[PDB]
Amino acid sequence: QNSPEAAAISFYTWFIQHDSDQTYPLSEPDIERYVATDTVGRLRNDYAHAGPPNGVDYFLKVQDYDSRDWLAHIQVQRALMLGDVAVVPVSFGSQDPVHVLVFLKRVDATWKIIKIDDTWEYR
Amino acid sequence: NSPEAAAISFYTWFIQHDSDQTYPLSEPDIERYVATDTVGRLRNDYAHAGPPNGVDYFLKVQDYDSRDWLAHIQVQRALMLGDVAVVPVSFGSQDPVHVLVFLKRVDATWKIIKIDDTWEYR
Amino acid sequence: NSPEAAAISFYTWFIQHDSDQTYPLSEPDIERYVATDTVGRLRNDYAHAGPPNGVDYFLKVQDYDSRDWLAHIQVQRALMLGDVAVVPVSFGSQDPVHVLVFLKRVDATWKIIKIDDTWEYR
Amino acid sequence: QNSPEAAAISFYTWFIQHDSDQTYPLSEPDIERYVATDTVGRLRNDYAHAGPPNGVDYFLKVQDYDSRDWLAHIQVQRALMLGDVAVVPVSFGSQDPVHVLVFLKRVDATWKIIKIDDTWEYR
Amino acid sequence: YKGISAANYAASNIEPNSVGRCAEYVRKAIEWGGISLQRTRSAKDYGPSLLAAGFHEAIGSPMKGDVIVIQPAPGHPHGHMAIYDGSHWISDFKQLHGFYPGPAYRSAKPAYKTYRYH
Amino acid sequence: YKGISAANYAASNIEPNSVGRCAEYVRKAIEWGGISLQRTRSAKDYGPSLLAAGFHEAIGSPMKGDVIVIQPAPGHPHGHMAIYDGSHWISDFKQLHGFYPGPAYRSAKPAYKTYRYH
């Protein structure tokens, strides 16, 4: 429905399905459809060098997860609009859900992810 | 006594102390609003490298209209991500600055554990 | 009662608990040896991402001869950098592993605040 | 005297003199005489992207300092030898000195810096 | 030697998360099965120790007891190793996602080999 | 307007370290000297506000009261600004090393301009 919630669900559905022992979504050229370009370029650099920030997956904020369970339990809350930036809470998993905050911006007709936040204290 | 209330009370206190000769993170009263480990790490980082990204950590700006901002603090209802409350806050009557305040309930008080801006990561 | 003594006592305790079904960082007795904020951050990071560099944080290896190591713990006299004591520690009778233990005096006890390996940063 | 202490003094004397508003030692091709190659390549990447680790100077562990005072008060302690790696404590400044730990390795005939540590608690 | 029993051991003796000892946990399980491997400190270097003990390199779909040795990835310079329990790879922890123990690994896709005893 | 007095103010009202408000601290000093600049949130964007208030771009050796505006550096996307006290650049803190407030800046060498009032 062209909403930021829908853009979030789509992205993660696609993400988890391209996160395996054979491929990783950041390596996929389709990542630029969902994530802002400069955010991709920065994350690729991060991953190739020191590795993923805080040593967890940047998009999912975990090291490890059951692909099947998460794929069936992606739960979004309605976005909070902070100016032109939509902040979408997303919960993963059927038990003890992981919570992330997805930041999106309108680029052309689309919502593009520009940042993803965990709920951890200031590091 | 809500996370929203803590966010407003904190920022009201913080912007009011703009005129003080002591930066507010050094005043022990900030511990009414910001979680103790968060206060400790921020004080530590300020002293070594200054704040992340070289902007005030709480306002996310390097400069601002103190008067306008104090008169235009807007908070929206807290969103709960597990036991973390996330409160959106806007400052100013024109082109507001938006931040996202993360708080946790310790005892009977909500305290800030993190504040993030809305800028793209790049 | 020296930083050296704390380093040996800690590692003796730690390698001895190799056979325990509980990883020692989860045992509250580790707080005798490691500073409280250091224990908290390590437990936190282990739970989220595992240890830095994917090796045991205290031994800096993924595997080792428990017996040999326990019988071959060598510490050199502490160097003082300000109020931080830096103790070199070697493990094993053959091709020893060397670590650098950073400790601070809190009350009357020396406690570990950081342990580093000797690998190049790259 | 071809000692790791001497290699440390030399390096920092040279460093501070090439740390100004006009130049920075990491940009200087002479950095490879004093610092291991892969350590240079990693630091250049760090600096260009997220910036210097922990937001302080990697070699001096401060944001700001008085060039003149530090240059006249570089103080080394004898190295601790951990196998083939020399760890040299260095103190900067005449008042409230900053303490770093310099890691060096023998590469050919020379001592090359491979790492530099602050005395801060685990981050 | 019972590769199955080694796998069963590893499954039983996992940590809730990585504790930076994939190699020791897998070595100890293999010991439970009946084989004492020559020690080496980093997971990436366990290949030779495995061939010496009678394992051979395996290619294809994994069987219970199969042992993987994975080369380093960014922020993980020592590599990784794990043993397959029939449905999950088991290292010092139970790997929900696959043989790569994390996103640094899935992103970089370092080389790996699987070892099997006969 | 007294550029000298503005400089003196900044020197007097520094923080022991950066508190992420170089722009406000310099703006407040300039106000002390007699000029109320049009506000803008990021140091990098203070050029237009300075020219509007009667400052002109200066090139050469710095004089007391001179105002520098520096473009962003890695990990510092808002830029920096400072006022010269006759021997040190003063922002929200007293800069011992020079006009670049840190190593991210000295390494990247972002563009800068110096402004002077008459």
Q: Give residue for tokens 């005892």.
A: B107
CATH topology classification for A1-123: Nuclear Transport Factor 2; Chain: A, (3.10.450)
CA-CA distance, E11 to E87, in Å (whole number)? 11
Give, to the nearest 10 degrees, the angle between helix E3-12 and helix E22-33.
Answer: 130
Residues from chain D that touch F99, judged by Cβ atoms under 8 A, are 21
| Resolution given for this structure, in angstroms | 2.4
Question: Quick count: other Cβ atoms within 10 Å of Cβ C23?
Answer: 20
Closest CA to F41 of B19, B100, B55: B55
With an 8 Å Cβ cutoff, is B37 touching chain D? no
In terms of Cβ atoms closer than 10 Å to its own Cβ (0-12, 13-18, 19+), residue C19 is exposed
CA-CA distance, B9 to A110, in Å (whole number)? 37
CATH code assigned at E17: 3.90.1720.10
Expressed in angstroms, the distance from the first to the final Cα of chain E is 10
- What are the distances in angstroms from CA A3 to CA A105, A110, A111, A115? 11, 9, 8, 17
**Residue A50, SS3 per DSSP:** coil
For chain D, give every domain's residue range.
1-123
CA-CA distance, F90 to D116, in Å (whole number)? 30
Whether the Cβ atoms of residue D113 and residue D35 lie closer than 8 Å to each other: yes
Question: Quick count: other Cβ atoms within 10 Å of Cβ F28?
Answer: 18
Whether the Cβ atoms of residue A116 and residue A92 lie closer than 8 Å to each other: no
Residues from chain F that touch B65, judged by Cβ atoms under 8 A, are 39
Estimate to the nearest angstrom the gap between the alpha carbon of D115 and the chain centroid: 8
Rg (CA), chain F: 13
**Sequence-separated (6 or more) residues with CB below 8 Å from residue A56:** A62, A63, A118, C48, C49, E103
F80 DSSP assignment: E
Q: Could you give phi then psi for residue D44, rounded to 5 degrees?
A: -55, -45
CA-CA distance, F6 to F83, in Å (whole number)? 8
| Residues linked to residue B36 through DSSP beta bridges, in sequence order | none
In terms of Cβ atoms closer than 10 Å to its own Cβ (0-12, 13-18, 19+), residue F53 is middle
Q: Where are the alpha helices (DSSP H) in A29-107?
A: 31-34, 37-48, 67-72
Which residue of D82, D98, D116 is the best one to mutate when testing the C interface, meaning the one whose CB has the most C CBs within 10 A?
A: D82
Domain count, chain F: 1
- What are the distances in angstroms from CA A123 to CA A52, B82, C44, D122, F46? 15, 19, 11, 12, 31
Apex CA A14: angle with CA A9 and CA A17, to 5°? 125
CA-CA distance, B115 to C1, in Å (whole number)? 43
Expressed in angstroms, the distance from the first to the final Cα of chain F is 10
By Cβ distance, the residue of F13, F17, F40 closest to B63 is F40
- AA identity, residue A40: V
The size of chain C, in residues, is 122
Measure the CA dihedral B43/B49/B51/B54, to 10°: 160
Q: Do chains F and B touch (3 or more CB pairs under 8 A)?
A: yes
CA-CA distance, B89 to B118, in Å (whole number)? 11
What is the extent of the structural domain holding E113? 1-118
What the block records as the tokens of A25 is 């979504």
Please state which CATH number belongs to domain B1-122: 3.10.450.50
Closest CA to A51 of B48, E108, D109, F9: E108
Q: Where are the alpha helices (DSSP H) in chain D?
A: 4-17, 31-34, 37-48, 67-72
DSSP letters, B42-103, are: HHHHHHHH-SGGGS-TTT--S---HHHHHH-EEEPPPEEETTEEEEEEEE-SSS-EEEEEEE
Whether the Cβ atoms of residue A62 and residue E106 lie closer than 8 Å to each other: no
Experimental approach: X-ray
CA-CA distance, A48 to A45, in Å (whole number)? 5
